[PDB]
Amino acid sequence: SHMSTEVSEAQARRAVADIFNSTLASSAIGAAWELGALDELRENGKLDVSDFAVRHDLHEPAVVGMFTALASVGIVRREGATVVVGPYFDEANHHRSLFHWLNQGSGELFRRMPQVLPNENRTGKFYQRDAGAISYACREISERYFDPAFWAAVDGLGYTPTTVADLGSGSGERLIQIARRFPGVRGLGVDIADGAIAMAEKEVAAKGFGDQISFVRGDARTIDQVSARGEFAEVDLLTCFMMGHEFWPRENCVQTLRKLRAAFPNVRRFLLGDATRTVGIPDRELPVFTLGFEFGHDMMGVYLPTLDEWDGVFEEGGWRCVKKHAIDSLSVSVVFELE
């Protein structure tokens, strides 16, 4: 019953106030996640606002504001000094990392809409985001939304991997988790960014896998002009999560996929996971994330393929898709099992 064109003034007032307040609630979800408040609420059902501020050493008036913001749209409820879970708590907390991504991660982009849309401004580095914050969010995005399909694909491999390469390795956690599952395995993380490599190297060394897992800074799109090509022949498992859209547009993807197939000639399975562009969902029925993901990429000047466009590119790129998993639901996102 959602799409009315005629409403009363009172209704229009309430709706616009909700849109306003939703903005603050939205930012609060990620902030409350980061400050530990969503985990307290989830675990205990309630908490005490002063007691929370004191234990975490937080400016109490702003803590009250954070919780009021959440309460303004029904995520929590305030009752005296107490905050209890509200009707939408479970759902909001489920998707907290998407909110964090939207706000803490990509806030500066969407805030700068007026300066980002003008063509005269769209050269070189024209927007800013928070890499540390995006990295914070993506860990849970990876774990909450992609892991079941990822591990289901790893379980149906039909062989034990001995050397695994991961494209866009980020924190290096995927490679670490792999090493945990397959004790004897070696790992190769490829990433185009210095912070990622360093962060990943540190974590790897700290968790005791400095002997099994290494890294190389490189562009996966131009993987054939990298300085670690001699190690590639040993790789029998390839993984690539949350970055496949960077290989687009179509013709670049085709080439990149060919290059990957030639560069990793002994890879058996290649597990490829990403979010994709949706078509024809009504404006008033967009689920969580979809709009942020698509509008964010349009603002950054980055093309996002549909699922159908991935489907249609694998054969030319040298790969056969033998299984596909739908993700629930991070917009329309999937894991392809390629060989």
Ligand X SMILES: C[C@@H](C(=O)C(=O)O)c1ccccc1
Binding site for ligand HF2 (CB under 6 A): 311, 314, 321-324, 336
Are 143 and 215 contacting, i.e. CB atoms less than 8 angstroms apart? no
The full DSSP string for 231-263 is GGGG--EEEEES-GGGG-SHHHHHHHHHHHHHH
Q: According to CB under 8 A, which residues from 278 to 317 bind a second copy?
A: 283-284, 286-289, 291-292, 294-295, 298-299, 301
Residue 25 is inside which H or E element, if any? Answer: helix 9-34
Cβ distance 98 to 242 under 8 Å? Answer: no
Please pick, from the candidates 311, 318, 321, 323, the single residue that binds Ca ion as defined by CB under 5 A. 311
Residue 1 burial (CB < 10 Å; 0-12/13-18/19+)?
Answer: exposed
* Residue nearer to ligand X on the CB measure, 105 or 218: 105
C-alpha 45 chain-centroid distance: 28
β-strand pairing of 163-167 with 82-85: unpaired
Identify which of residues 103 and 333 has a Cβ nearer to a second copy in the complex: 103
CB of 141 to ligand X, least distance (A): 5
With CB under 8 A as the contact rule, which of the stretches 29-37, 176-184, 198-206, 217-225 interacts with a second copy?
Answer: 29-37
Partner in contact with 301, chosen from ligand HF2, ligand X, a second copy, none, beta carbon below 5 to 8 Å by kind:
a second copy
242 sits near a second copy (criterion: CB under 8 A) = no
Q: Smallest distance from the beta carbon of 11 to ligand SAH, in angstroms?
A: 31
Site for ligand X in 107-136 (CB under 6 A): 134
Q: Find the binding residues for Ca ion in span 243-302 (CB under 5 A).
A: none
174 binds, among a second copy, ligand HF2, ligand SAH, none (CB under 5 to 8 A by kind): ligand SAH
Q: Which of residues 244-303 bind ligand SAH (CB under 6 A)?
A: 246
Is 218 within 8 Å of 256 (Cβ atoms)? Answer: no
- Residue matched to tokens 């229009």: 12
In angstroms, what is the minimal distance from the CB of 208 to ligand X?
27
The helix/strand/coil state of 210 is coil
Q: What is the CA radius of gyration of the chain?
A: 22
Query: Which residue number, 1 or 123, has a Cβ lying nearer to Ca ion?
Result: 1
For residues 236 and 302, is the Cβ–Cβ distance under 8 A?
Answer: no
Q: Which is closer to ligand HF2, CB of 56 or CB of 320?
A: 320
Length of the chain: 339
Give me the helix-helix angle, 173-181 and 194-206, nearest 10°.
Answer: 30
Joined together, the tokens standing for residue 68 give 């009021």
Is the CB of 239 or the CB of 276 nearer to a second copy? 276
- Exposed, middle or buried, 303 (CB in 10 Å: 0-12/13-18/19+)? middle
Using CB under 6 A as the binding rule, the residues of this chain from 142 to 181 that contact ligand SAH are 142, 168, 170-171, 174
Which of ligand HF2, ligand X, a second copy, none is residue 324 near (CB under 5 to 8 Å by kind)? ligand HF2
Q: Rule CB under 6 A: is residue 191 a binding residue for ligand SAH?
A: yes
Site of interaction with Ca ion (CB under 5 A): 1-2, 4, 89-90, 139-140, 228, 230, 232, 308, 311
